[PDB]
Amino acid sequence: KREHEREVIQKAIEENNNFIKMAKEKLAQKMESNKENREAHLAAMLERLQEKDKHAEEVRKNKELKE
Amino acid sequence: MRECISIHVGQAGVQIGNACWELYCLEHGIQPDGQMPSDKTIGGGDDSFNTFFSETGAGKHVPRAVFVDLEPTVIDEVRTGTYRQLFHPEQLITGKEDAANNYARGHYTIGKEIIDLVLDRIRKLADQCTGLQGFLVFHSFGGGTGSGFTSLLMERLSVDYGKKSKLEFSIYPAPQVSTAVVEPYNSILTTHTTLEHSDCAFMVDNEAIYDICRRNLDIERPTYTNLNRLISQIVSSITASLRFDGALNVDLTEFQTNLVPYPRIHFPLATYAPVISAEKAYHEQLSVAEITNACFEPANQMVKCDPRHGKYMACCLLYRGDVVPKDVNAAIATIKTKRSIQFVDWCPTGFKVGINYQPPTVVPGGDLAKVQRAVCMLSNTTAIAEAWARLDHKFDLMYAKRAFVHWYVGEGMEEGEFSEAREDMAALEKDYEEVGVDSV
Amino acid sequence: MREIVHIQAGQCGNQIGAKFWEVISDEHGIDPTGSYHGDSDLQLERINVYYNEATGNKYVPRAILVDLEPGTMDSVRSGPFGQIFRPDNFVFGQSGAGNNWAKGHYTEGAELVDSVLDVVRKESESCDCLQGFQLTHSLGGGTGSGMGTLLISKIREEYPDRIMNTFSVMPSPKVSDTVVEPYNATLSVHQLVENTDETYCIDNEALYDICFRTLKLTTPTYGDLNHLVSATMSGVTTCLRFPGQLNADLRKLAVNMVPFPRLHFFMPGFAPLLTVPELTQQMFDSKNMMAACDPRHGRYLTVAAIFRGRMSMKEVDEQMLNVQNKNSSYFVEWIPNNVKTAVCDIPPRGLKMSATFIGNSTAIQELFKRISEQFTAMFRRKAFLHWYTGEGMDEMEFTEAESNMNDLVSEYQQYQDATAD
Ligand SMILES: Nc1nc2c(ncn2[C@@H]2O[C@H](COP(=O)(O)OP(=O)(O)OP(=O)(O)O)[C@@H](O)[C@H]2O)c(=O)[nH]1
Ligand SMILES: Nc1nc2c(ncn2[C@@H]2O[C@H](COP(=O)(O)OP(=O)(O)O)[C@@H](O)[C@H]2O)c(=O)[nH]1
Ligand SMILES: O=C1NC(=O)[C@@H](c2cn3c4c(cccc24)CCC3)[C@@H]1c1c[nH]c2ccccc12
Ligand SMILES: [Ca+2]
Ligand SMILES: [Mg+2]
């Protein structure tokens, strides 16, 4: 009986810690994933604005090469 | 001991907090500067009101509360308001930019920048507790902060405080006082994320409160102030057992034992009575039987639904004022033989009763009449799932076209989170359907 | 606070830009010297949204004035409230666009744009928390059109996490005889659909028809057209400028108005041109739209409306519910509660009560089809195309701008035809 009593409270501690542990990890995973995505979205936005600059160079270049 | 820390998140949470704490002060005879003449133990004490108020050596009674918002203008009114002396400046936390009606910004982009600070300030309150019981979290479903930041906070609180109890007062969105078209999105996302981290959540349908203010107090177009003063009375009724003592006083945790049959089934339906104007209450005494019978009038519910078309899994009556058990039992006996009250077959049908002799209180220049007795019924009904159904439908209409989803994706979220959240709600609607089915 | 940085480019942009500042400076109760002489604290509650506070309680508009020709710059400085604008925020070239988009976007403007950004950067760096930019310009010209869209792209590079809003004036043969305008418009739209979050489609065709047929003004002046614009711009920014039941910013407006990123072209409306039921029916009437489009030729994705003045709010709520019910077919059902009503206690100047309307309607395609029709009529003949290729442009950039605006139309048509089931 004493042995069973120890196993019950130990199980309660284990499940409590497991819940804390999983919650801490599930959150870290989410904030990381969200950081990647938001960055990749802003990075893509800047890349095609970069393409608009490169294009403008090719336009101004094309002008002086027609004179 | 048995201290309770309140956390008020976003505009709705903060402004409701203002109403609640103002009401608490008047019920306990606490002045706007925090002084409480009737309290003879200076600088401390183990009285009942100490569950919600700490004490400084100068005799100031300070709310065990943190106010958080990602925008400063709402809390700035608290900082310069009537009860500005009540709170230590560190209890009032603000950012410079709100979540813009976006769950993603409240949970990730903007919220992550202030989450560590909030937890530190919460920790400072907890370290002043000799026996912290749990947290009470006030927030809206629809706001970006009330939605996004709350769910982040709830997750972080489960990590930092383990299985310490966390209760919710959640404002369910209504079109009459809507602030964004994406409130259904924010609602579903928060409910999903917070579900595992909340032990009990009291939803407050703004349309229900809007209707009651129009119908019972004859307010042609209720303001947030009108809604909040009514809400604070319901909140006061629920927390009354924690803030007062009495022979017939029943602790909220005991009601909670009956109200939550399964972890996910933790959304009680609140019903309050009497809500009546001064004009109508004059020369008009509402008896115990009358206010108790009013608890089974759907028009008086905090959430729009029809319990008469559902099944009960618990029924609790929280009385306050001039009330004795004899009149309660008589009123209940009458009601049982005249109302559509049916329980599931796996639960006992007895009503759990609590009485706090401390009479109801009203705020100066308010609309609510001051009455000698009031009652708040807390019932666990399958009918509350109707609130989920209405929200989930509005969610489906927009998400089938992915309307407004790009505002969330742009903040780093994925469509998988939307579908994951919606499936959890679908399972929750199914859960409430299953518990209502008769046993084999 | 939450600051908005104002920018006005080209002739048209500075005209309506100056008018906008004249009107709201009056509403917030400040004189051309920048001093406050009002009576209500509500005028200064959210004043920092558009104004910087200088020494001796001087309120300076957070505005940047731009043009490739120094002519209009003298007009503003000499015009009323000319002494309120920050002198250093005046950025002017000497060239002049000559209604050439390529000059404003790639040549002349690309040489002046950096000195504009230096002023943008200086204003922005002082902000407590910048929420975004609002630009006033026309799409028919060369500077405000060509260089205006260049600035947007350049500003979006340094502030990709800020809201970009524009008050774009659409060209109309009823007002401007200039032939090349449908080129400048199409090329501008090609930019706005990609790099702006919200665009108020101020349509000269609509502005003309209102003055002529309703206000009974034959041969209407630009002053007449702008009196409509100013009243509109005043209305749609009320929620940004004053405290109310719900306070709004550029982001919260975009979230609620734009269900899909590209579909961010609003048709504004105004009423009158009374009692509550009268106002509500007029603001939903096609005659009161500042964009030459019939809303009953499409469906509303989202709708925003202010009612200004002291009136029965119970009545306004009932009438707005009334209109949605009687006109339910013209609001998409797959977006629940897609109509919101706002209320400001303070009325405009002259009117005891008014109502301004912001509609994200699929009927806006009619406006783009008009431009596209005038565009392709010129492009099939390659008329005046040498003015653009002369600056180094390619025929493709015309084709791409055409097909992109074609997609915008068909995309508006897609969600018009969509159903719940
Ligand atoms: N009952 C009640 N509801 C409120 C109150 N204030 C806001 N709400 C509701 O809250 C919802 C919007 O959430 P908010 O709390 O206003 O927004 P937030 O939490 O500050 O988050 P942000 O979007 O970042 O501003 C709306 O549906 C409102 O009806 C209030 O004082 N009382
Ligand atoms: N409503 C209005 N439209 C204008 C005004 N001035 C010019 N426009 C329009 O703008 C177009 C000409 O562009 P403009 O502003 O002159 O080009 P820019 O000054 O070189 O950028 C025409 O289609 C006009 O209808 C004005 O004061 N009010
Ligand atoms: O103050 C506000 N902020 C917002 O986001 C606006 C809004 C638009 N929709 C909303 C919805 C819900 C709630 C708020 C808003 C439904 C769809 C469109 C709202 C507003 C009402 N009338 C206006 C007039 C001018 C400028 C802003 C507004
Ligand atoms: Ca004490
Ligand atoms: Mg807020």
PDB file of C-alpha atoms in Angstrom, chain B residues 137-317:
ATOM      1  CA  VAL B 137      -8.117  36.748 -16.568  1.00  0.00           C
ATOM      2  CA  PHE B 138     -10.328  39.428 -18.148  1.00  0.00           C
ATOM      3  CA  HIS B 139     -10.227  39.836 -21.933  1.00  0.00           C
ATOM      4  CA  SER B 140     -12.210  40.039 -25.172  1.00  0.00           C
ATOM      5  CA  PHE B 141     -12.376  37.370 -27.869  1.00  0.00           C
ATOM      6  CA  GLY B 142     -12.414  39.869 -30.724  1.00  0.00           C
ATOM      7  CA  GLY B 143      -9.583  42.287 -29.987  1.00  0.00           C
ATOM      8  CA  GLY B 144      -6.075  41.586 -31.231  1.00  0.00           C
ATOM      9  CA  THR B 145      -4.659  41.981 -27.723  1.00  0.00           C
ATOM     10  CA  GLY B 146      -7.546  40.367 -25.858  1.00  0.00           C
ATOM     11  CA  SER B 147      -7.257  37.440 -28.260  1.00  0.00           C
ATOM     12  CA  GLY B 148      -3.605  37.121 -29.232  1.00  0.00           C
ATOM     13  CA  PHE B 149      -1.790  38.317 -26.118  1.00  0.00           C
ATOM     14  CA  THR B 150      -4.118  36.560 -23.672  1.00  0.00           C
ATOM     15  CA  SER B 151      -3.495  33.158 -25.250  1.00  0.00           C
ATOM     16  CA  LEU B 152       0.265  33.801 -25.169  1.00  0.00           C
ATOM     17  CA  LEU B 153       0.023  34.849 -21.527  1.00  0.00           C
ATOM     18  CA  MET B 154      -2.102  31.834 -20.584  1.00  0.00           C
ATOM     19  CA  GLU B 155       0.444  29.508 -22.190  1.00  0.00           C
ATOM     20  CA  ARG B 156       3.306  31.194 -20.337  1.00  0.00           C
ATOM     21  CA  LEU B 157       1.406  31.106 -17.038  1.00  0.00           C
ATOM     22  CA  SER B 158       0.929  27.343 -17.317  1.00  0.00           C
ATOM     23  CA  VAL B 159       4.702  27.014 -17.644  1.00  0.00           C
ATOM     24  CA  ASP B 160       5.568  29.379 -14.789  1.00  0.00           C
ATOM     25  CA  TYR B 161       2.804  28.332 -12.371  1.00  0.00           C
ATOM     26  CA  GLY B 162       2.118  24.744 -13.433  1.00  0.00           C
ATOM     27  CA  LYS B 163      -1.429  23.638 -12.625  1.00  0.00           C
ATOM     28  CA  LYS B 164      -2.289  26.722 -10.578  1.00  0.00           C
ATOM     29  CA  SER B 165      -5.924  27.525 -11.363  1.00  0.00           C
ATOM     30  CA  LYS B 166      -6.651  30.016 -14.147  1.00  0.00           C
ATOM     31  CA  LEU B 167     -10.189  31.360 -14.566  1.00  0.00           C
ATOM     32  CA  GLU B 168     -11.494  33.480 -17.448  1.00  0.00           C
ATOM     33  CA  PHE B 169     -13.986  36.267 -17.974  1.00  0.00           C
ATOM     34  CA  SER B 170     -14.236  36.336 -21.763  1.00  0.00           C
ATOM     35  CA  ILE B 171     -16.166  38.909 -23.789  1.00  0.00           C
ATOM     36  CA  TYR B 172     -17.983  37.171 -26.631  1.00  0.00           C
ATOM     37  CA  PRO B 173     -18.311  39.442 -29.695  1.00  0.00           C
ATOM     38  CA  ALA B 174     -21.545  41.112 -30.823  1.00  0.00           C
ATOM     39  CA  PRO B 175     -22.355  43.069 -34.020  1.00  0.00           C
ATOM     40  CA  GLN B 176     -23.998  45.951 -32.112  1.00  0.00           C
ATOM     41  CA  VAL B 177     -20.627  46.922 -30.604  1.00  0.00           C
ATOM     42  CA  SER B 178     -18.240  45.221 -33.024  1.00  0.00           C
ATOM     43  CA  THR B 179     -14.769  46.679 -33.629  1.00  0.00           C
ATOM     44  CA  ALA B 180     -13.513  44.420 -36.418  1.00  0.00           C
ATOM     45  CA  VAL B 181     -14.800  42.129 -39.167  1.00  0.00           C
ATOM     46  CA  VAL B 182     -12.219  39.461 -38.225  1.00  0.00           C
ATOM     47  CA  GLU B 183     -13.453  39.048 -34.635  1.00  0.00           C
ATOM     48  CA  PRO B 184     -14.700  35.539 -35.461  1.00  0.00           C
ATOM     49  CA  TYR B 185     -11.148  34.599 -36.525  1.00  0.00           C
ATOM     50  CA  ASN B 186      -9.651  35.990 -33.325  1.00  0.00           C
ATOM     51  CA  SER B 187     -12.358  34.261 -31.282  1.00  0.00           C
ATOM     52  CA  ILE B 188     -11.715  30.781 -32.687  1.00  0.00           C
ATOM     53  CA  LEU B 189      -7.929  31.151 -32.505  1.00  0.00           C
ATOM     54  CA  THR B 190      -7.964  32.217 -28.838  1.00  0.00           C
ATOM     55  CA  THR B 191     -10.457  29.617 -27.670  1.00  0.00           C
ATOM     56  CA  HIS B 192      -8.387  26.879 -29.311  1.00  0.00           C
ATOM     57  CA  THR B 193      -5.055  28.058 -27.898  1.00  0.00           C
ATOM     58  CA  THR B 194      -6.380  28.799 -24.396  1.00  0.00           C
ATOM     59  CA  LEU B 195      -8.564  25.688 -24.020  1.00  0.00           C
ATOM     60  CA  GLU B 196      -5.914  23.446 -22.424  1.00  0.00           C
ATOM     61  CA  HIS B 197      -4.686  26.254 -20.161  1.00  0.00           C
ATOM     62  CA  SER B 198      -8.017  27.363 -18.646  1.00  0.00           C
ATOM     63  CA  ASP B 199      -9.828  25.532 -15.832  1.00  0.00           C
ATOM     64  CA  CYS B 200     -13.058  27.535 -16.057  1.00  0.00           C
ATOM     65  CA  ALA B 201     -14.258  30.324 -18.357  1.00  0.00           C
ATOM     66  CA  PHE B 202     -17.251  32.616 -17.887  1.00  0.00           C
ATOM     67  CA  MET B 203     -18.292  33.908 -21.304  1.00  0.00           C
ATOM     68  CA  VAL B 204     -20.161  37.211 -21.511  1.00  0.00           C
ATOM     69  CA  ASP B 205     -22.143  37.735 -24.716  1.00  0.00           C
ATOM     70  CA  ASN B 206     -22.063  41.477 -25.440  1.00  0.00           C
ATOM     71  CA  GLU B 207     -25.357  41.176 -27.354  1.00  0.00           C
ATOM     72  CA  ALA B 208     -26.947  39.611 -24.277  1.00  0.00           C
ATOM     73  CA  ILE B 209     -25.716  42.472 -22.094  1.00  0.00           C
ATOM     74  CA  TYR B 210     -26.675  44.945 -24.826  1.00  0.00           C
ATOM     75  CA  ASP B 211     -30.222  43.547 -24.880  1.00  0.00           C
ATOM     76  CA  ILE B 212     -30.564  43.584 -21.088  1.00  0.00           C
ATOM     77  CA  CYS B 213     -29.453  47.220 -20.864  1.00  0.00           C
ATOM     78  CA  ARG B 214     -31.991  48.154 -23.545  1.00  0.00           C
ATOM     79  CA  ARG B 215     -34.828  46.022 -22.192  1.00  0.00           C
ATOM     80  CA  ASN B 216     -34.477  46.226 -18.405  1.00  0.00           C
ATOM     81  CA  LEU B 217     -32.724  49.573 -17.832  1.00  0.00           C
ATOM     82  CA  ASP B 218     -34.336  51.343 -20.803  1.00  0.00           C
ATOM     83  CA  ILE B 219     -30.981  52.494 -22.188  1.00  0.00           C
ATOM     84  CA  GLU B 220     -31.761  53.332 -25.816  1.00  0.00           C
ATOM     85  CA  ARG B 221     -28.175  52.765 -26.986  1.00  0.00           C
ATOM     86  CA  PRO B 222     -25.892  51.220 -24.309  1.00  0.00           C
ATOM     87  CA  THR B 223     -22.258  52.338 -24.082  1.00  0.00           C
ATOM     88  CA  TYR B 224     -19.285  50.307 -22.858  1.00  0.00           C
ATOM     89  CA  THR B 225     -19.843  52.028 -19.510  1.00  0.00           C
ATOM     90  CA  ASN B 226     -23.426  50.750 -19.442  1.00  0.00           C
ATOM     91  CA  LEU B 227     -22.339  47.216 -20.316  1.00  0.00           C
ATOM     92  CA  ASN B 228     -19.400  47.165 -17.894  1.00  0.00           C
ATOM     93  CA  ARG B 229     -21.384  48.253 -14.846  1.00  0.00           C
ATOM     94  CA  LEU B 230     -23.771  45.357 -15.421  1.00  0.00           C
ATOM     95  CA  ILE B 231     -20.912  42.922 -16.063  1.00  0.00           C
ATOM     96  CA  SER B 232     -19.089  43.963 -12.882  1.00  0.00           C
ATOM     97  CA  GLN B 233     -22.179  42.996 -10.881  1.00  0.00           C
ATOM     98  CA  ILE B 234     -22.070  39.479 -12.327  1.00  0.00           C
ATOM     99  CA  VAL B 235     -18.320  39.327 -11.696  1.00  0.00           C
ATOM    100  CA  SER B 236     -18.855  40.596  -8.154  1.00  0.00           C
ATOM    101  CA  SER B 237     -21.479  37.911  -7.516  1.00  0.00           C
ATOM    102  CA  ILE B 238     -19.082  35.175  -8.640  1.00  0.00           C
ATOM    103  CA  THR B 239     -16.087  36.459  -6.646  1.00  0.00           C
ATOM    104  CA  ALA B 240     -18.191  37.357  -3.591  1.00  0.00           C
ATOM    105  CA  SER B 241     -17.446  34.058  -1.839  1.00  0.00           C
ATOM    106  CA  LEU B 242     -13.727  34.785  -2.179  1.00  0.00           C
ATOM    107  CA  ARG B 243     -13.995  38.365  -0.882  1.00  0.00           C
ATOM    108  CA  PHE B 244     -16.416  37.773   2.008  1.00  0.00           C
ATOM    109  CA  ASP B 245     -17.082  35.189   4.725  1.00  0.00           C
ATOM    110  CA  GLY B 246     -20.306  33.773   6.131  1.00  0.00           C
ATOM    111  CA  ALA B 247     -21.881  30.616   7.523  1.00  0.00           C
ATOM    112  CA  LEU B 248     -23.825  29.876   4.335  1.00  0.00           C
ATOM    113  CA  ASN B 249     -20.955  31.122   2.171  1.00  0.00           C
ATOM    114  CA  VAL B 250     -19.839  28.514  -0.366  1.00  0.00           C
ATOM    115  CA  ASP B 251     -16.398  28.855  -1.946  1.00  0.00           C
ATOM    116  CA  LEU B 252     -16.239  29.245  -5.728  1.00  0.00           C
ATOM    117  CA  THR B 253     -13.966  26.196  -5.918  1.00  0.00           C
ATOM    118  CA  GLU B 254     -16.783  24.011  -4.571  1.00  0.00           C
ATOM    119  CA  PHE B 255     -19.160  25.200  -7.289  1.00  0.00           C
ATOM    120  CA  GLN B 256     -16.320  24.565  -9.730  1.00  0.00           C
ATOM    121  CA  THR B 257     -16.202  20.910  -8.659  1.00  0.00           C
ATOM    122  CA  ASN B 258     -19.804  20.528  -9.828  1.00  0.00           C
ATOM    123  CA  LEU B 259     -19.526  22.789 -12.884  1.00  0.00           C
ATOM    124  CA  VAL B 260     -16.681  20.972 -14.678  1.00  0.00           C
ATOM    125  CA  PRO B 261     -17.442  17.282 -15.402  1.00  0.00           C
ATOM    126  CA  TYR B 262     -14.687  17.062 -18.008  1.00  0.00           C
ATOM    127  CA  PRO B 263     -11.685  19.386 -18.506  1.00  0.00           C
ATOM    128  CA  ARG B 264     -12.915  20.772 -21.855  1.00  0.00           C
ATOM    129  CA  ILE B 265     -16.476  21.225 -20.566  1.00  0.00           C
ATOM    130  CA  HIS B 266     -15.643  24.269 -18.424  1.00  0.00           C
ATOM    131  CA  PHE B 267     -17.897  27.049 -19.768  1.00  0.00           C
ATOM    132  CA  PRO B 268     -20.670  27.850 -17.255  1.00  0.00           C
ATOM    133  CA  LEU B 269     -23.731  29.865 -18.271  1.00  0.00           C
ATOM    134  CA  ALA B 270     -24.260  32.843 -15.972  1.00  0.00           C
ATOM    135  CA  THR B 271     -27.694  34.352 -15.325  1.00  0.00           C
ATOM    136  CA  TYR B 272     -28.232  37.404 -13.121  1.00  0.00           C
ATOM    137  CA  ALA B 273     -31.263  38.953 -11.441  1.00  0.00           C
ATOM    138  CA  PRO B 274     -32.725  41.410 -10.757  1.00  0.00           C
ATOM    139  CA  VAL B 275     -31.645  43.933 -13.390  1.00  0.00           C
ATOM    140  CA  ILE B 276     -34.115  46.766 -12.849  1.00  0.00           C
ATOM    141  CA  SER B 277     -34.227  50.568 -13.042  1.00  0.00           C
ATOM    142  CA  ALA B 278     -34.706  52.835 -10.029  1.00  0.00           C
ATOM    143  CA  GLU B 279     -38.071  53.931 -11.430  1.00  0.00           C
ATOM    144  CA  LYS B 280     -39.405  50.364 -11.501  1.00  0.00           C
ATOM    145  CA  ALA B 281     -37.769  49.164  -8.278  1.00  0.00           C
ATOM    146  CA  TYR B 282     -39.377  51.956  -6.249  1.00  0.00           C
ATOM    147  CA  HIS B 283     -42.193  50.572  -4.081  1.00  0.00           C
ATOM    148  CA  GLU B 284     -41.386  47.192  -5.642  1.00  0.00           C
ATOM    149  CA  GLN B 285     -39.716  44.422  -3.626  1.00  0.00           C
ATOM    150  CA  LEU B 286     -38.470  41.480  -5.692  1.00  0.00           C
ATOM    151  CA  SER B 287     -38.645  38.436  -3.413  1.00  0.00           C
ATOM    152  CA  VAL B 288     -36.361  35.398  -3.348  1.00  0.00           C
ATOM    153  CA  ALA B 289     -38.863  33.419  -5.416  1.00  0.00           C
ATOM    154  CA  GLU B 290     -39.131  36.183  -8.012  1.00  0.00           C
ATOM    155  CA  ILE B 291     -35.396  36.662  -8.613  1.00  0.00           C
ATOM    156  CA  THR B 292     -34.807  32.902  -8.567  1.00  0.00           C
ATOM    157  CA  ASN B 293     -37.510  32.368 -11.183  1.00  0.00           C
ATOM    158  CA  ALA B 294     -35.852  35.103 -13.240  1.00  0.00           C
ATOM    159  CA  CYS B 295     -32.738  32.903 -13.478  1.00  0.00           C
ATOM    160  CA  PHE B 296     -34.635  30.572 -15.822  1.00  0.00           C
ATOM    161  CA  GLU B 297     -35.740  33.390 -18.117  1.00  0.00           C
ATOM    162  CA  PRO B 298     -33.345  33.216 -21.105  1.00  0.00           C
ATOM    163  CA  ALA B 299     -33.589  37.010 -21.463  1.00  0.00           C
ATOM    164  CA  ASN B 300     -31.502  37.370 -18.282  1.00  0.00           C
ATOM    165  CA  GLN B 301     -28.601  35.170 -19.420  1.00  0.00           C
ATOM    166  CA  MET B 302     -25.061  36.451 -19.992  1.00  0.00           C
ATOM    167  CA  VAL B 303     -24.920  34.326 -23.149  1.00  0.00           C
ATOM    168  CA  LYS B 304     -27.602  34.064 -25.821  1.00  0.00           C
ATOM    169  CA  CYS B 305     -28.814  30.464 -25.971  1.00  0.00           C
ATOM    170  CA  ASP B 306     -31.800  28.282 -25.037  1.00  0.00           C
ATOM    171  CA  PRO B 307     -31.183  25.930 -22.066  1.00  0.00           C
ATOM    172  CA  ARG B 308     -34.803  24.784 -22.428  1.00  0.00           C
ATOM    173  CA  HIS B 309     -33.679  23.010 -25.615  1.00  0.00           C
ATOM    174  CA  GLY B 310     -30.575  21.587 -23.927  1.00  0.00           C
ATOM    175  CA  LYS B 311     -29.597  19.482 -20.914  1.00  0.00           C
ATOM    176  CA  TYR B 312     -28.177  20.513 -17.544  1.00  0.00           C
ATOM    177  CA  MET B 313     -24.989  19.080 -16.040  1.00  0.00           C
ATOM    178  CA  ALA B 314     -24.983  21.357 -13.000  1.00  0.00           C
ATOM    179  CA  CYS B 315     -27.015  24.157 -11.444  1.00  0.00           C
ATOM    180  CA  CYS B 316     -25.578  26.587  -8.903  1.00  0.00           C
ATOM    181  CA  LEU B 317     -27.331  29.530  -7.238  1.00  0.00           C
TER     182      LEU B 317
END
